[PDB]
Amino acid sequence: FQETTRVLTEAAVAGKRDELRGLKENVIVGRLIPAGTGYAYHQDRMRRR
Amino acid sequence: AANDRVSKAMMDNLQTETVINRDGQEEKQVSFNSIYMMADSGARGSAAQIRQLAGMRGLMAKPDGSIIETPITANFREGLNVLQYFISTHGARKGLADTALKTANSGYLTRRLVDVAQDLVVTEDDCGTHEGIMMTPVIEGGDVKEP
Amino acid sequence: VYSYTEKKRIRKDFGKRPQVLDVPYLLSIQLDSFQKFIEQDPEGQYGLEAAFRSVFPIQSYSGNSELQYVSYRLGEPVFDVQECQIRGVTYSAPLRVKLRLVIYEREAPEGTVKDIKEQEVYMGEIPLMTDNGTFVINGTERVIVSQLHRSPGVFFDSDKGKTHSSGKVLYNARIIPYRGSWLDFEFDPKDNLFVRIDRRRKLPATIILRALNYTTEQILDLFFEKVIFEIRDNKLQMELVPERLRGETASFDIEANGKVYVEKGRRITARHIRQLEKDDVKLIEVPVEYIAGKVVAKDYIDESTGELICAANMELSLDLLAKLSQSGHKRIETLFTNDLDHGPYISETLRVDPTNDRLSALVEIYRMMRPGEPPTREAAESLFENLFFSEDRYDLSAVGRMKFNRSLLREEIEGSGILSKDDIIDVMKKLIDIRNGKGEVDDIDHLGNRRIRSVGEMAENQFRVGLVRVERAVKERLSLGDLDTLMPQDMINAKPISAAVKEFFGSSQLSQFMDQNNPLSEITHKRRISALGPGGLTRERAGFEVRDVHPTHYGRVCPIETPEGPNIGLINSLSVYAQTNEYGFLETPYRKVTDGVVTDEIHYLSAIEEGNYVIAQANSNLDEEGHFVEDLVTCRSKGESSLFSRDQVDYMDVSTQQVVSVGASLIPFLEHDDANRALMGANMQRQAVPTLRADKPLVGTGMERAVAVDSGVTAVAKRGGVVQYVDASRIVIKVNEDEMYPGEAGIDIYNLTKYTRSNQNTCINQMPCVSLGEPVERGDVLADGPSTDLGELALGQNMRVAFMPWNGYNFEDSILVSERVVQEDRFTTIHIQELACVSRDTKLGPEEITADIPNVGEAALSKLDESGIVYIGAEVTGGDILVGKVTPKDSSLRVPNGVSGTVIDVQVFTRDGVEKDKRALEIEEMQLKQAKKDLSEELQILEAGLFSRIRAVLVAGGVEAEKLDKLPRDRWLELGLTDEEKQNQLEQLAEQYDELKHEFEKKLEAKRRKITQGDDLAPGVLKIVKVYLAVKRRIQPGDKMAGRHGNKGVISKINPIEDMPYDENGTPVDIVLNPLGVPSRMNIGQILETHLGMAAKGIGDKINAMLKQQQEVAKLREFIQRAYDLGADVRQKVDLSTFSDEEVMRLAENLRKGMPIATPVFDGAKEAEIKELLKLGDLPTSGQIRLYDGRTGEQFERPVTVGYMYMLKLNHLVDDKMHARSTGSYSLVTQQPLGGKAQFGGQRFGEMEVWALEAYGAAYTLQEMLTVKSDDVNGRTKMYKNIVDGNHQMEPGMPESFNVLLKEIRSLGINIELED
Amino acid sequence: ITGGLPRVADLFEARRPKEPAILAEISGIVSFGKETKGKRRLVI
Amino acid sequence: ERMGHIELASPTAHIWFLKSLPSRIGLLLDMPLRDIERVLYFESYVVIEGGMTNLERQQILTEEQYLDALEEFGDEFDAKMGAEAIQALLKSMDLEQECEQLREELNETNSETKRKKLTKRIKLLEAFVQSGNKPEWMILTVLPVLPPDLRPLVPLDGGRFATSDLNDLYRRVINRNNRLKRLLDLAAPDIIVRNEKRMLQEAVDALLDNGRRGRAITGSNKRPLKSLADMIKGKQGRFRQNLLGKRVDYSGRSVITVGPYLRLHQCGLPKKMALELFKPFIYGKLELRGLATTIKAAKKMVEREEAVVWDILDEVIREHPVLLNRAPTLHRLGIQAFEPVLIEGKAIQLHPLVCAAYNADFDGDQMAVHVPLTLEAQLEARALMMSTNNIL
DNA sequence: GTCCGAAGAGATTCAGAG
DNA sequence: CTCTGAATCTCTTCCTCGTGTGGTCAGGAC
RNA sequence: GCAGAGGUUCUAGCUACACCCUCUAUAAAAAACUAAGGACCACACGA
């Protein structure tokens, strides 16, 4: 979105971890988005976990 | 007030210009003037637009917004004087620059909004919560805006 | 009377107003500016010599060596303009300077110089501007654009509402130099004047004042009124001058002369003020608390001991009152404070002022400017006196001083370029008054504060920067003052000057690439007034204010013509008549109005001058007697439209077409259409394309001829005479006797330029519009260039247009052109493409251009010659080979896919050191043959004229019938005359004739070896071959195409001619516009244009009928005369009586296609005039015909408008925008085209596209787009191999761009892991 | 005091206006506790 | 994928923590950012393990103060200078003890400003100790490099191989590191090694983000260098240009026009760009039908656009939706799908009624066209994208 | 052959008042 | 006097696509 | 046809995304065929 340096630094120092579960995150990583025709795929994935 | 009177006269002459022969006596009905057909039908052109086309151009503002004491007497059918055209160009360039900057800021706002609500996805058939919103018709002093 | 050109087609012209000032040279703003740059201008003004004189004097520390400037000469250009455009070299001229190196006598520098020396020293290269107002830098006509920037001079900005979050409008004063540091005086929201040098950290006011060697007493005396108080033996009798009684209340018993005046609980009325003034009082009795609230002015010490009673600006108090009283110091000066009259703004700055003395002020200034290092006294003092007191760093140009003294009411105009302390304190006082209501702020948008820097000034500034770099170098060299060793050439080098000037004219912010596609575009891109550029705004920094048209743009800057989009307003175009001022402001022509009667005297006025004057509108009834019948004639007051009296006016507008640009002066009926659509049309009028055969506008503006003659597109006759020999390539003009040069006269060969690539890849073509034996005069037009017709401007063409919805094909805005347009080749446009190819110094054998290509069949070698270059005129298509370029081990330049068409010309440049190959040999041979042909052509006819000159003396009394034609041709001199010395005169003239042939042959060989020379190129290339593809693009369903009234459309379907709706006569209308684009997009002018075009074509066919079937000259002449005289009060008054009775037939032939109409933009034909013109032809007055349908063959109800709108054809074709990619190139990030989708790259599924896709829920489609269709190279090739097998599977994979991001954000210590 | 796109931007940005109306977070009697010593006081 | 590490001759600060808005180095060391900058850039010393002398472990002193303190205690007092000093201060600090002590004084120091600042610092300390990373790793002693292919030399003309505006940054860092290593090998006087280490730190700053401190360095054409943070942040950064908005294959563009003869689920499509789009589909159909045997033969056949190719193309576009798309798409009705009908000319033809949604204006407007490929994606386009399914 | 504006938003300093 | 607040400086983002025009990118010395 | 080489063409051709045949240390009876490709800023604009 914005202020990539700020958020990246805050995530780094905090040791933050991303549990994607989101539209833009999956878009960046390229997997199915958890909203639409991929919602069933993602619900199955979270069911397996 | 003069502009409003001019608009009313222009309409009352244009929207019934057809005075046709009714098998005998004379009757007048909604005119078939092509401009009025394209305006009244809602095809292209509003009543204010056709008024500023045929009747008065009304008044128009300076850059700040304070309108000129001397309005645009003429219209677009007949000739338009030089000073009147300069006064018109004031508002025309104002709107044009505004619309370009509008597209810029609106694109930015759209990105901001869609990146704040990107992750919200419907994921349950019901939440089972009685809590809601006491939705009512909106009356902000005037009549009902949204029934 | 009319010149011979318009005598063959006299443009029918409306417009009642008799124009008093003809349209000036439209390129004057460029040409005059550059000519001013290249001149020796004294008395300050901008010249190249001026910069020379202001930079060359060099002082040396103990070197005793100085540099003196004498003169500068620009050498003859190395290559002509056309040659430069062919090669690529900059059309320049060497800058030969005659510098003087002088060393004064050692042990006595006060004496003269002991060793002087003069040498014509090189300085660099100055790119000259050709006659057309263009620069040719890298062989491309690269025109400059004049810049409009905030002029130097103090400006008192308002800055309303923004800060303090209170609406309290502070007042900041800004004084911008021309070359220096911006200085800001700003007010604290707490009302404390703050100085801001270079907009840097805020700093209190008095530090600058203290840095001016001031003290607190002096500052307080300069800034405030002093209330005098005296110590008298009765409680220190107070003194109050009654002038300070402006609406103050009386907290005390106002009394004097033993008489009470104002009691408690009252304010002093102005009547009481004048009563006190007439009482002639100075003293008054107030309680001592009143003086306590005052503030002391001057420093006071106890003379009994010498200790400070109280410092300056120290508030009084009871203890301080006692310290004053018991000290015997009878003198008290208090600061007169008042919220209304004189607020105490500097006193609070002193309260805030941390610095005390001048040294501390300098130290603080040095700290804020250069932080960190210890602020040495010498360093700080030098910084201040070099920042605001040195001509070397703070030179306000004469315009800056003029604006400064104007805005500070000082009557002086000229002065030094620096700021005296008086200037600083005056700016302080003016800002304080602005805060105190006296005097008002000024708006930057006002054209009296925005200056115009043309090419000359910007180039001169860049040249001065280069010169200060060079003078630094000269001082560096002069550290070792060698004498009698080096001539005045070695101490300098032309490299810095050349670098600066070349960078400014090439890779620079305003050295724009001229958009050569229409003479209108050529002109309007030179009159462009850009607010961008160095020292100016940006497309993002600009706000709503600067965009909008100020009420002073009237007649100075066109408010209509303006690039829509991001750079709206910033790049407005100069209006028609608005020449630049001497200083740099915008003057506009106005007519002096003596009381009662307007005169013809033209008085150019700047915006500041205009406000004071009263300007009447051009569209008023003067009739050359003035005395506007309208006693309430509309006038322009101080920036406000306000109707005035008849005698109250002082100036009047010059012409009704003054307020618009030339790009908008072309638009007919500009009165009617809205300014939005007018701007759109004037922008899409610069974007036409030169049509195959140009066609005059059936309804123009009469000034298109001016814009077509002033531009360089049309070869104008600089010398009147009779056309001796015309040709499609050259025009030979036989000069008349009156215009002859004294001796060695002859012809004037206007060598036309045939098809040459433009900048926008259009055909710069010239067509001779004359015949063998038709006289031409001065300023005549000979060769119609691109988009010109008989000297007029014909951007597009004109065809029948009917406004009706035709089965939705013209649904929203789309045009529906008939197949008749394409069939008659009406809109075909030549496009010239260029395919460069170079031969580089590759190791183990250079790049050689040979037909010895491997792995190619005879089809590849077909179009190529025996030396690897395609023949001139091969119908090449996509992928075909044109240039060999065998590299050491096949890099053949091939036709990029899509582009097609013939190849017109190949140019083979070559630097010395490599022998030209066979095709290059043939090219050189034909070029030298052409050069010799041209030279011999200008030899033989010139010698014939020279013998005619010599035959004149052999016919001036001594005429010899056979004795003349009995001596050989080379000797028509030695014959029988009556002089007794003419015999020897003729023998020596024959000797001169032999020498003349010698100089002619030497010129021929000079041109030959100019061609034969090795063309120096970029470092590392052997020889460049340039190939010119020449496609033939025409109308197809998708070419953007518009009329002049901003009615932009796109072709929808090439409708068969039968389908087109035909009128009663059966003439099918070629175009069916969409009517519904008129009301909303309010451009009703295009319908007035349509009706007038219909009337014009009615006149055309009316005369065509009586010319098709032969009718005598009398009937046609009377009809043409009546057609011209029908106008109500038209100024043209064309009479056909004076015509030769045979050129009237030529006029009719040029008129049979349609009577060209001219309606000046704001004085066009009214309803009655166009109606009468329609009724003259056998045409309906209503302007609407009954178009029978082309398919149904049934009458259209509601008869529809039919007329000849002048439809352009915009450059935005479709075959250069029809793009599609299956799979092609990829990048380091595996994006396809990355930077430029022109390399057969796919579209960008942009940022908003993924949102618009995931809003549906297209997870599979989105995953496709951003993993397997674009990024996942392994998955991409796997899915390709999958699809070519019928199966349509998919593999997600990892987006390689995400891997790039992973590695990048992992390469900076932030560990990233795809942890599972 | 703007009624266009900046109004929507200001709303969705939750920008407190430069002159915001001040409200009381607790219900009760209004008073001026201090004697406006620097600024006025409101005690509920 | 391969990376390389630059063994810094001395530890150097990480800009993303120094002179940043979060100012992590500020909260962590409880120092002013100004003072941290001063010690790192070698303007002033910072003390470590002062001990008996009055200077504590967290004080900042000038060079004259350094001389005076050296007089106070010759060796027990230590004032390391530069980034090594910050490294040592981070080493000496223990998170857990400091975290619990900060919690202790947070429970008592009720000052609202102090409460906010202490909560910020304690949040940083807790999220930094519970997360598996030590505070020493803020000071990067070993800079890694990008993979060389992610940072290549592009051209061959003019100046042979130009740079990537990052190779020069890494070269500057390497050169400064090499000169510092040479100075440490030659034991140069401390002032010149201070200058060398300071400019090494500045070069590392420019590499990390050219423009976070002072005059952004430039040696190529007087413009700021595209640092690593430049390639990540902003529109031009990877996140937005190259990740969310990847340019796609099987796509095309053309100025669009109106065709009434079309249906609502249809759109015009030039035969040229349709052929250029579905080339893999054409290859597959030709290979199935036997009109060609290899992809070379199919490429030749489609490049000659035989009449056997057109009727095969109209066969493969029987029920294959394509995603029309306008460039300034705002609502999701800005990208629909249609069954494209093969027509002559160079312009996509859009149904009139679906121009109101597109905001199409037919005055030279260009619409991108995209082709779903996988049958799940084509079916998804048919079910959702197609205009007859999103009328509301 | 190889090598030296503007707008806001937030973090951060002054101050001024208890 | 020290802490809620006044200011101060500073940093990030500003439709998204195209057609395109160009301009640009590490030497001499040992 | 998955690690190499050879073959009738045309230096070289072993699935390199890639096109035919042979075998595990040996080179020819054989026609359709071949190359995996490129960055950053300013400007005219256009919707």
Ligand SMILES: [Mg+2]
């Ligand atoms: Mg449009």
